[PDB]
Design a protein around this ligand. Structure first.
Ligand SMILES: OC[C@H]1O[C@H](OC[C@H]2O[C@H](OC[C@H]3O[C@H](OC[C@H]4O[C@H](O)[C@H](O)[C@@H](O)[C@@H]4O)[C@H](O)[C@@H](O)[C@@H]3O)[C@H](O)[C@@H](O)[C@@H]2O)[C@H](O)[C@@H](O)[C@@H]1O
Length: 106
């Protein structure tokens, strides 16, 4: 992805190596305190009522923009698809890939 034009949050890239699921996210710096999570469906495409969660962490600023990078990396038993949830300044935002969710192959 590119630095977004307006979106509060936008996944950039991700990888799954068989066990470790990781990635990088564009996050608008709306306010300082943020919660950025990756909510996923497991290997059988079970979303488990939004209970499969990885917390992302601040990575670094994006100079001259209103965005910053956040990253995540965690062990998962299995994963078919996911979206990003972002809470900041009392509001919840999502990047669910324009309703498609992000897919992990196989
Ligand atoms: O008992 C099983 C019955 O479920 C089947 O369908 C249920 C749907 O469950 C999954 O949905 C997960 C959903 O998660 C993301 O959506 C996020 C949205 O929800 C937030 O909380 C917020 O309100 C929204 O802003 C946010 O966008 C994904 O983006 C989304 O794609 C996911 O669907 C399945 O993934 C769905 O496919 C299912 O429709 C089934 O229909 C029943 O027949 C079963 O009995």
């Amino acid at each position: 992805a590119s630095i977004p034009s307006s979106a509060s949050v936008q996944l950039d890239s991700y990888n799954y190596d068989g066990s470790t699921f990781s990635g990088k996210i564009y996050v608008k710096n709306i306010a300082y305190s943020k919660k950025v999570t990756v909510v996923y469906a497991d290997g059988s495409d079970n979303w488990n009522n939004n209970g499969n969660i990885i917390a992302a962490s601040f990575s670094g600023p994006i100079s001259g923009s209103n965005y910053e990078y956040w990253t995540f990396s965690a062990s998962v038993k299995g994963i078919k698809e996911f979206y990003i949830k972002y809470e900041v300044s009392g509001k919840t935002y999502y990047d669910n890939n324009n309703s498609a969710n992000y897919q992990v192959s196989t």
